[PDB]
A paper describes a structure:
However, the development of endolysins as mainstream antibacterial agents first requires a comprehensive biochemical understanding. This study defines the atomic structure and enzymatic function of Escherichia coli O157:H7 phage FAHEc1 endolysin, LysF1. BLASTp analysis with non-redundant protein sequences indicated that LysF1 belongs to the lysozyme-like glycoside hydrolase family 24 (GH24). This group contains phage endolysins, such as the well-studied T4 lysozyme (T4L), and bacterial autolysins, which cleave the β-1,4 glycosidic bond between N-acetylmuramic acid and N-acetylglucosamine in peptidoglycan. The multisequence alignment reveals that LysF1 contains these conserved residues with Glu15, Asp24 and Thr30.
To better understand the mechanism by which LysF1 functions, we crystallized LysF1 and solved the structure to a maximum resolution of 1.71 Å. The structure contains two protein molecules in the asymmetric unit each comprising the full endolysin sequence derived from FAHEc1 (residues 1–154) and two phosphates. The completed model reveals that the overall architecture of LysF1 consists of three regions, a catalytic loop region (Glu15–Lys41), a connector helix (α2, Ala51–Lys71) and a C-terminal α-helix bundle (α3–α7, Gln79–Asp149). The protein exhibits a cleft between the catalytic loop region and the α-helix bundle where peptidoglycan is proposed to bind. The catalytic loop region contains a β-hairpin (β1–β2), a structural element that is conserved across the glycoside hydrolase lysozyme super family and contains predicted catalytic residues Asp24 and Thr30. A putative catalytic residue Glu15 is positioned at the C-terminal end of α1 facing into the cleft. The catalytic residues of LysF1 are positioned 8.9 Å apart, consistent with T4L-like endolysins, which would accommodate the peptidoglycan and water molecule between the side chains for catalysis. Therefore, the catalytic site of LysF1 is consistent with a peptidoglycan hydrolase that inverts the anomeric center of the peptidoglycan glycoside during catalysis. Inspection of the LysF1 crystal structure revealed the unusual appearance of a charged side chain (from Glu88) positioned within the hydrophobic core of the α-helix bundle. Wild type LysF1 had a melting temperature of 53.6 °C. Glu88Leu was the most stabilizing mutation, increasing the melting temperature by 9.4 °C. The methionine and phenylalanine mutations increased stability by 7.1 °C and 4.0 °C, respectively.
Numbering used by the authors: -3 to 154
The structure:
């Protein structure tokens, strides 16, 4: 089985919620110019300081950004998958990246029908590298618990 699922409206709303929104470019904590819903590239080109966009543009850029992540989750899933399970897996993959999702325990458990196990293993992805050392991010712990709620219970953030 290969996926042809799409991110739902509720799934896009959840990724928006996790990213936050700025209409003026800002330099993130790592020094990368960022705009909209966590966008760092627009139509293949970097975000630039001083740029201002509309909320409509921000949604357009986020839709373009998430497309390859939707594709990758479709290709990684080997079993029938509910819309909320798909939304959660795309949200998490959008944060951890394609390679991390592909080789993850959570995707193995999803493909074995072990939903509870998948929700547990999803939440292992809470570390960030700081000064060459892996540090637990409280922000990521929060995002992981909200993505597990989408995956298991179809309960989306507000």
């Amino acid at each position: 089985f290969q996926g042809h699922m799409q991110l739902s409206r509720k799934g896009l709303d959840a990724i928006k919620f996790f990213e936050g929104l700025e209409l003026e470019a800002y330099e993130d904590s790592a020094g990368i110019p960022t705009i909209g819903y966590g966008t760092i590239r627009i139509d293949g080109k970097p975000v630039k300081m001083g740029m201002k966009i509309t909320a409509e543009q921000a949604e357009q850029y986020l839709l373009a950004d998430v497309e390859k992540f939707v594709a990758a989750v479709n290709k990684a899933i080997k079993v029938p998958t509910t819309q909320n399970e798909f939304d959660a897996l795309v949200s998490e993959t959008y944060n951890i990246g394609i390679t991390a999702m592909q080789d993850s325990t959570f995707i193995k458990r999803h493909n074995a029908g072990n939903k509870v196990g998948c929700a547990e293993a999803m939440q292992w992805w809470n570390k960030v590298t700081v000064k060459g050392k892996k540090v637990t991010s409280n922000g990521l712990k929060n995002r992981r618990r909200m993505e597990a709620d989408i995956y298991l219970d179809s309960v989306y953030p507000k």
